[PDB]
Amino acid sequence: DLCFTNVYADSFVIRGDEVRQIAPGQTGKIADYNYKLPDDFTGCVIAWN
Amino acid sequence: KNKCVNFNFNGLTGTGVLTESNKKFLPFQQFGRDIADTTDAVRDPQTLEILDITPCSFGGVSVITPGTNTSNQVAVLYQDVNCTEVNVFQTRAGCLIGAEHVNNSYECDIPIGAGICASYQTSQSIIAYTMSLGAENSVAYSNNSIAIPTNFTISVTTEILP
Amino acid sequence: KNKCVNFNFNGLTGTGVLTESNKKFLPFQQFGRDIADTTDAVRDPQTL
Amino acid sequence: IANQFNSAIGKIQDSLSSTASALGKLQDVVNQNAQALNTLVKQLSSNFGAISSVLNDILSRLDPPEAEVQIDRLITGRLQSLQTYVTQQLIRAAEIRASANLAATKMSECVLGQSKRVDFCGKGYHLMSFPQSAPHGVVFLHVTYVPAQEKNFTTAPAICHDGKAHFPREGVFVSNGTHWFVTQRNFYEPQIIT
Amino acid sequence: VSMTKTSVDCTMYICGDSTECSNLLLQYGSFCTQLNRALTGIAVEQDKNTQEVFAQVKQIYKTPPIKDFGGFNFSQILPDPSKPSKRSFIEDLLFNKVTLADAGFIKQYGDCLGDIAARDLICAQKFNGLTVLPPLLTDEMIAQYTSALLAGTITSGWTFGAGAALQIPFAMQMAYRFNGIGVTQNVLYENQKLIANQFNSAIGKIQDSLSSTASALGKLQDVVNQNAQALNTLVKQLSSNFGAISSVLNDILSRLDPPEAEVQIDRLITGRLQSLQTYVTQQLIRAAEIRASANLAATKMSECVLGQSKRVDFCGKGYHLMSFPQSAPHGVVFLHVTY
Amino acid sequence: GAISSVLNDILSRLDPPEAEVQIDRLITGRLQSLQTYVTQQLIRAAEIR
Amino acid sequence: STQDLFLPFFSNVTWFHAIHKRFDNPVLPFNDGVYFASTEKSNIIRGWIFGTTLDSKTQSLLIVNNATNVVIKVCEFQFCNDPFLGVYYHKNNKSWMESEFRVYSSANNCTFEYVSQPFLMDLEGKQGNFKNLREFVFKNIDGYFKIYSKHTPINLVRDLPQGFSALEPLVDLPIGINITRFQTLLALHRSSSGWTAGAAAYYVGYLQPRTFLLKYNENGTITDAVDCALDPLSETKCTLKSFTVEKGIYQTSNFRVQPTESIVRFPNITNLCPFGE
């Protein structure tokens, strides 16, 4: 029903233990160090094996 | 256009009226907003035209009726509209459907507004009359006339205050 | 009965006083409510 | 006057026993007190944005981690109901106190004294007022001087006797058409102009 | 005397043209009934406050065409039949120096639809549920309520408020009101050509005080301003995000599920209800200010217009003789004759 | 209704995703306090006037 | 004050009957929900078939009564164009007993089945007045079919009586299907297409999401109800929360204009996004 203006895909491969770290407000070697999400992040996270 | 519909522009859903406008959007601008921050205008993404969003449910509704013990016949006063939406009569407050115009100006029985008052009188229905100001008296005035009572009365006026 | 206790009827917990009433519940009805929407009456599920 | 006054006291019985809407001002004071107390019970049936309105439901369903999300919606909904209600009471109490200061003004000046204030204690020249006990208020019985039977008279400002104007000390100049008379304003008692 | 009768639709203001919001709003029960009861309670008493001031006699009085006043010119206070509304020259200046809304309380839907004016204050409130109720006593009638009280003051003196209208000449009316303030009545007739020139020049000073100086009506202009700004503030209340992710009801209905929207829409409903509980609080306190002034205006009508005020400096500086009622926007203007 | 009354505690504990749940409870609690207080002042000012 | 799917007062309901030359079992919509009301004397209303397309291509509900058990089945039915259950050959030893079972042809993939207690229904024919009033509320929201049953004796020849009856829920059926169209069974008699029909009546009205008021007595039975969308008189009853409107004027709401149709306007593009890339 709702559609979006500027869709950007963030495609990369990490360890399976650190997928929950991809969230607005988390830490880790992925979240805190190189791939950080904003505090006002309005988006979707799609991950698979 | 010109009908209250359920619009959907770029995912934004709502109830509004689409009309043409003289507003010209900038090429990076899509949504027009108001003081109340709601979307007042959108832009058609297929063809280049500008459409406003007018909110629906317009016109106040007054309920002019006596008690349910007396009768169930009612008169509905529609403010801020003419008699188009809907014994049809137009008053100074709005369209009044259900009350017959009576030229006899009586005392105000039901306070309505805009100098109009109603009552349930005589086949009995709600009548619509102009609110009378009272019994008009013409004072016979001159430079050599005076009215002085030869007799009076003692009336006990009851004023009741909390 | 007739004492302020901590009742528990079908999982609904609260503080109230249990007295007899002349109200007759419908067979599909269990809880009676008030103007304030709180439970004014319950039904004993073991005996009627 | 004793027959006109005692018949007017009998008209108070016909105005209160037959017509029950004469006390509708103080009935509205009782009604706005009784309905707002009855409205405050209806305030408890609002879900307040939570999943239910009843405090006993959330205590029986949800954990205190998940109940403080829901009970604090009920507490805020019941407090804002009271902060609206105390707002409705203080504005109503400011209306009654402004009327009670008006009632204390109509007791000191209108009952305990004679009111020179024109049409403040009802229509007519006010003589005295009688205090009567009323539910959450007072009812005054204002004794008024109202003229009933009047006539049209010929008047004049002054009179030339010896070339000098004569003005009334207290009263007016009236005439029945032949001779000029003197009387007061609120009653016609013709006297010789002396 | 009166104020702007406002009946805010709390069904439309909280949930604007929404079915899913109105299904959540009707769970709140008696919130929209208790606020509409207070606004109706204003709408009854402000018509009552206009009733207690302008309508204190059951009979309507008019002046005879034969004018014998003794040099006193009363053409500036009596209404003019040449205008479509029977108003005096003073009452025409009072209705023009106060800024009101558009002509008539009926603004069409096509006037707001066919022409969307840039920053139009009246239409934008009406699409937010803010309806302005018209008063019971129109300004065409209020100019005739004051005309009935003025014709009784000129022709009948002060006896029209204490009973039936009993005529007395204005030369005798001014002589007997001097005895109320302690002046012997021989002062009047020795200077009747002088006092009539001093009074008619003072009526000409009312024209120089109202037409040139537009800030003399700033008290009743502030009554219109505090009514118009608070109605315009209530539109600005809808732009507040209320702690939610957005202020618009149509955004959350287009983004979030009803599991996640009841977290967000109930923040909008509480933010709009508290705004209405702010506004009804601001109206009832303001209505208590106007009613205390309308009870003061009814005190300055019964005692100061219908009678002679023995109260010193209550009706202006000087020994008060009589006062003239004039129709004003949501109020009254008195013309106090002082010694 | 929040976890604490102090504004400086939530700014030192929670992320702005989780603080807007908590600080907006403090803002609403302080504004309704000011909404109650101005109500108490205007009714008292109507008594003095 | 409650808010659910309700039949509005003074609404447009249907006019269908059974008689010895009008026989009506039409295809009726059920977009939001339907209300049922039948004045009967001879137990002619036997049941319904609730389906989406009324075919074996979809899953359908079949609530019937074969004079022994209240049969409620959710299967893949072979839908016949005219379902009926007839009573045969009365002339000697009547007994009012059935022969055929013509509501469907075959049923497979049965997911829900309800067989009630065996009872002996009096299927005898009557003349003159209708002595039974069977009213039902039919709605399927969130996969939870709510039925509401009420039976009261009436004395009626003609048009639906002006009265009130609080309908009570009998059972709760977890059918889990989509219902868009439905029909109604009727009984057939003759003193297999030369049969006739006994005197019957049934009324169908569409449920709408309206707001009612519910005035309860001391016993708990609803005495009277008021729809909030009839007129501004009845909306004043919803605002004042009293059925006796006092003598005066109460501002209820604005003149609401419902939207006619849903308008969708999206950008025009035919290329899919690179989900494979």
Numbering used by the authors:
A (entry chain A): 389 to 437
B (entry chain A): 535 to 620, 641 to 676, 689 to 728
C (entry chain C): 535 to 582
D (entry chain A): 923 to 1116
E (entry chain B): 729 to 1067
F (entry chain C): 971 to 1019
G (entry chain A): 50 to 69, 77 to 247, 255 to 340
Provide the publication's sentences verbatim.
Spike (S) protein protrudes from the surface of the spherical virions and mediates virus entry into host cells. It consists of an ectodomain comprised of the S1 receptor-binding subunit and the S2 membrane fusion subunit, a transmembrane domain, and a short intracellular tail. The CTD directly engages the cellular receptor, human angiotensin-converting enzyme 2 (ACE2), and functions as the receptor-binding domain (RBD). Moreover, we captured an ensemble of cryo-EM structures of SARS-CoV-2 S trimer in complex with the Fab of 2H2 or 3C1 up to 3.8 Å resolution, revealing the MAb-triggered stepwise allosteric rearrangements of the S trimer to coordinate the binding of neutralizing antibodies targeting the SARS-CoV-2 RBD, also providing structural basis for MAbs 2H2 and 3C1 as noncompeting antibody cocktail.
Moreover, in the same cryo-EM dataset of S-3C1, we additionally resolved a ligand-free close and an open S trimer structure, termed S-closed and S-open at the resolution of 3.0 and 6.3 Å, respectively. The S-closed structure resembles the tightly closed ground prefusion state captured in our recent study. In the closed state, all three RBDs are in down conformation, whereas for the open state only a single RBD is in up position, which is thought to be less stable. We have recently showed that in the ligand-free condition, SARS-CoV-2 S trimer dominantly adopts a stable tightly closed ground prefusion conformation (no RBD up), with only a minor population of the particles in the open conformation with one RBD up. Here, our structural data showed that binding of 3C1 or 2H2 MAbs could trigger dramatic conformational transitions of the S trimer (especially in the S1 subunit region) from the tightly closed ground prefusion state to the unstable, loosely packed open state with two or three RBDs up and released FP. Of note, compared with the S-closed state, the S-3C1-F1/S-2H2-F1 structures both exhibit an untwisting of the S1 subunit region, with the fusion peptide (FP) released.
